[PDB]
Subunit: 363 residues, 5 copies
């Protein structure tokens, strides 16, 4: 995504002021086309009122501009954007926590599957390759950034995520439904086959591996759930009527009428509404928070970088069960072997952050 | 339901604008009958004011139209729709997560119940058939889309979800209460009977199966809970008084009075209120979000497709414990057997999504 | 409670319109006495203004009616009802999920406590009778609907929930505090006594039973917590001042003044305020949502039917560990023994609900 | 706290009306001193305007009173009280659920630690005494009601929560940080020492005890977390500026100006503002909800009664592992030994609460 | 952070009034520079209007000041600050609960890893040193207060958190991604190596240690998640446009116009706006709640004191597995050996807090 966490660590003077100058993933990149439509529809109405209309027709238009200005109220639109965006953002973070990480299975496979030989090394690599394949097959079904990377099953085989003997089995299992559950069943049968040859010692270690598989299966079941059960379409169509009804009234009610007749509220002619345009960046920009996060697996600048994460999870999983299985650093006494009060040193810029120990608020 | 997740992946120009043109499951299909009642009651009042009423009676009506326009305020109605719909939508997603999925039991039954013979294959099919039957009997009690598919117990037997010898036992258990708990007790006794014949090796594998049964029993207990304990009727009757009190005031307060008397606020006669009708699509359409989601197991276009999901869960469960029990693809070295840095390839349209690795915000 | 889930399954025309006509548990049964107080205090003021007051006193009253009409504003009252009712309803559903269900213990006791003889059958009935007694003793402490059914310990013994030999032990345990924890300790010692005679095979099955006891103990600890720690009284007294301050201003500010003096806002005399009474059904009815749900174990029409649920949990628990212990239907091949694509049939009214399988949004 | 759950069980007429008459823990006991400051500052301004000021100075004051009345608006203050109190109340209930209860450890220690002799009885009393001591040492650090009961370690020894041989060990462990974690480490080593002498049979029962210890350790870690990480001080200082800015404007803007000049809005002189004082009970009373719950372990009338709960948890824990270890009532056939349909009897006042069994909404 | 929990324990008179006088971490330290910009831009406009502008130009400016005063409305800005700060604060507390604590692993390592000799003591110190190193490597990636303490890997070795033989292994593991997962894999292999030499007795104790490792791995995975997936930048840029659009209108609309022309609303010249400046402390100060909590690991006065917590977790973990392994106080009969009703004594200031036991609300 767009990470600006380093910029906003402290509350300086230009903390949020400098974030308005950024372009990538900003409000300006989203509202670029909607602004020029709103400018062009605004000044077309103003040039008709200032050049084209006759005197009897300008009086007819000024009664229309005072009628539209009454319904152009800001308060009830801010309600329905507030409860809708709070629904989208709560669904947004819940889909990030549903993205499966191999690291809980990675710890147990790398220690409880014995064997330093060729067959035991091959057994640990195949277990973790199924756990990655059970995650690639659910991300390519829900993320357009992954589906363009893997458009077919042949692209999965060419990437090494599925050997060609597995694809021959994967096609013979004739099922019309989605097949993301299949590598998470091959994980269960290979782990039990590992137990029956003595690669796992006890049943408690086998059940501990199978419990972390079903955690990863429930993670993939949530991503299938948020993708299939969208936000209700009637509740998306409400909040986009109310935003477009507000901006329809502001095309007519926020014109600059002729001050020589001196209507109440239009005493000054300024040729460009500064504060009406700033409400367009406010209200339409707070709708673009909903348009960008309603599917966080697309190709926006703030959607999830899932193509990166597949490349991370493949490299890390095949490194911890292959190059780190029973390969430990040599045990040695640390620096605090005889010191019961360890005091790690401070640098110069951090030495004012030495706080006394918090004993409790009652002291 | 109605899935539009593919349309709203990116934040383009016509992202939410194109969703207003869709018909199925939209605001127009719900508000079709309420709109024509509101049009017919509106213009009946206008034709009486413009044709039927005398001059002394029009003056009596104009004082009524200015009285009703004061109570036709929009702000406090938007409060009580906001907190009510946020209750319905939070209950809406919590009932989707209560729909039981067999896949956690499906992994453990397909690996820990040994036997490739006829009796062991028959034992795994009967365990998963009880877990599906314990879900069909709770969905036909809470979903009108399932009850019309299975109106009696005889339809369950004809669908193969219950053998006729089981229905003879299911009727002899004389109980006045709902009997969805019975197949989840038959699962427990058959799994212990499987252990005593040596089909399950250790007690830890038996307890791991029985823990995933009680998870599925707690899933069925929530669907029984949301169906029995509705949203409070006094709290549904409040939010439908406040919407109908608003539209009652807008039938009289939003008339176009005679501009020749020039009341403040009614200076223009336009013969059709454009912005009053757009508030009808806003407020009554944001009540139809509550009317459609208050029971998401009915037959609306956005209620849950549970008839599909029974057909999925029956086909997948009897495929993973029958055709996939100890039927593995042949183990083979993958492409990254000697490469400690796996780099899966990118397509042409995805090659700009190569990001450097996120090391942390402090770097 | 009042279940109307069958009525609101679909979004028809008269979906929420027909719910206003229902009486039981409605807004009309709650606001019956408060409405007649508000009518009688309203028209008493109006008859004094129209018959009793002199001309100099009516002028003094009209300045009071314009003063009270300024403070009779609707917006800030709707805030504090919104956040207060959202607190009550979140506490309301959290107390339903704290009501203990025996069904998770019922599965494990009915399969892991061996013995088809007289002593083993008596052992399973006593385990489940303690789990029901540990729930009756916490419901009679928190629910007035249960305490009127069981006013003393003698009513518990006459209902068969406690044998007279257990009450002799239950009184000798001299403790001033509440004794709902005692049957959940007798469950632990009887389950360990069952293990030492060989009725439970392994320690893993014993710990699986004891884990589901402590789940039920934590359920009873929440019901003790919500009953002892109420909503703060200062926060209940705020929201009932603001509702009564609003209705105090509407008794004077919403009078119909004399239109012959033509005050701004009171141009019409109508003898009965229609929209002021509809705000009484709105605001006072949205306070009755809080008055009814602040203790959902009382005797309102929408409080929890806990007297029913004790009769269910006693009949079901003593049926699954007695008549269903190792009493299985005969294993038999189902209809889909040779069909790898099960297609359960559809009825006539459900045949349009055949959907193609959802493969994912990217397809 | 103040428990009024018995009063508000039903929705009668005077349900919330009678709660305004209560004194203890009410809005009147909190706002007693702030009201007399607000009365004395109000009528001091009024007596200066009515007696002290000259004619040219009263005209200068009336322009100030109309200026302050414009900023005395109620709507934006109600926002920031609503989101702040909803933060406090969500943190309030989360600290009650963090208060550790011994009852989950109490079940497992009372059954799995064998021995009816003197040493086995002494072993169970010492395990539960560490679990109470690990809770007293965290409550005296976070609760001022407990710290005044136990000001030093010597008061803990005199209360019998720590034997003098344990305090000699508790002081030799030289650590500057808070030492609430020490009795939860002594519990782990004594439970393993119990296993190695044969007092606990299997490792599964030992791990089941140690899992319920770490649950209680995570409960004490939350109370340390809510006490150390307060609500942000900048977010407390915002909501108390906005309340005091509102009441500063109401000291001048809500004066009764002279009606002989007849300003718009001040047409009547009434000598005491009734509705301005009722907004003081509303807004300042809804700030006292935040002032009382921001530390629920203090000595307010609605803070948590934790001194009571230590006396409960000490008496109950040493009663269930001492007088109830393997002391069971005699097993006997209950009343429903031969009746498969148990029907417990109803009293006279409860016989109308016989409901038919809820089969599901689709029936 | 800034802990004021001792001050606000009771609801006294000056409870929240005294918090405005505090400087550290307050609203005044954050708004110090933004206030002087707002003062200097305000009085520059006022001195131009009072000294520089001509008579025809002052009339042109007064029409601009009445135009800007209409858009300077407070209500819709308070919506979008309310939903944005409620998002930040919910993410704020969720990152505190993601900070890993060693104390759950600390209990199990200190009891289940046998051996009082030199090798067994060295084995327990190395297990807990990996669990601290797996937390330092994730905090130095997300916290600028920790990264300035440990700028490189060489500072980790000099602090004794990593022996130089481990850094030689830590560099040979060639991976471009972040390496916080590596010490949580070394923990798994050393714990299994401990089992194979007989330092851990059974597999159930080994799986209990490995389950508490993966809990700590999921804690570190959340801190990596909140740091990488920020609040959406478009949703931060909306709420800072709306605050700055409000203050732009208040620089012109809140001027004091000339009262000799007597515009409606500007009847009095007061030379300094008191209530406009108090809205600056309100609105801009309620934006500084968001600016300070959006990254709670920085160096603000209310960000998390994580440098302290590393020094605590290092001292406590190496004290409980070294000086407290099987070092128990001597078992002895407590004071309540023969008293079945323990009554711990009360002090003088706490003796009025003797409450009778809460039996339940129905009594
Ligand atoms: Ca997107
Ligand atoms: Ca529906
Ligand atoms: Ca009630
Ligand atoms: Ca307090
Ligand atoms: Ca910060």
């Amino acid at each position: 995504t767009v990470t600006y966490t380093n910029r906003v660590a402290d509350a300086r003077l230009g903390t949020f002021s400098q974030l308005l100058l950024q372009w990538k993933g900003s409000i300006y990149k989203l509202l670029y086309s909607e602004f020029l439509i709103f400018i062009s529809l605004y000044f077309a109405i103003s040039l008709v009122y200032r050049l084209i209309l006759s005197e009897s027709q300008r009086l007819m238009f000024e009664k229309l501009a005072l009628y539209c200005n009454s319904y152009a109220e800001l308060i009830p639109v801010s309600f329905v954007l507030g409860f809708y965006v709070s629904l989208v953002v709560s669904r947004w973070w819940a889909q990030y926590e549903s993205i499966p990480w191999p690291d809980r299975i990675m710890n147990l496979v790398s220690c409880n599957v014995d064997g330093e030989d060729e067959y035991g090394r091959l057994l640990r690599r195949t277990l973790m390759r199924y756990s990655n394949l059970c995650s690639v097959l659910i991300l390519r079904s829900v993320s357009t950034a992954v589906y363009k990377r893997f458009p077919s099953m042949e692209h999965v085989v060419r990437a090494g995520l599925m050997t060609p003997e597995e694809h021959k089995k994967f096609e013979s299992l004739n099922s019309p439904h989605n097949k993301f559950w299949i590598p998470c069943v091959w994980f269960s049968n290979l782990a039990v086959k590992a137990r029956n040859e003595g690669r796992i010692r006890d049943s408690v270690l086998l059940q501990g591996i199978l419990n972390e598989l079903n955690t990863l299966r429930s993670q993939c079941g949530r991503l299938y759930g948020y993708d299939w059960i969208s936000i209700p379409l009637v509740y998306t169509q409400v909040v986009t009527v109310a935003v477009y009804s507000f901006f329809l009234a502001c095309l007519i009610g926020r014109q600059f009428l002729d001050p020589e007749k001196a209507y109440p509220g239009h005493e000054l002619d300024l040729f460009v509404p500064v504060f009406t345009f700033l409400q367009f960046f406010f209200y339409a920009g707070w709708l673009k928070v909903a348009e960008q996060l309603i599917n966080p697996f697309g190709e926006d600048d703030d959607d999830f970088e899932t193509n990166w994460l597949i490349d991370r999870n493949l490299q890390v999983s095949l490194m911890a069960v292959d190059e780190m299985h029973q390969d430990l650093p040599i045990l040695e006494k640390d620096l605090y072997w005889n010191e019961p009060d360890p005091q790690p040193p401070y640098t110069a810029a951090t030495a004012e952050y030495k706080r006394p120990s918090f004993l409790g608020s009652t002291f």
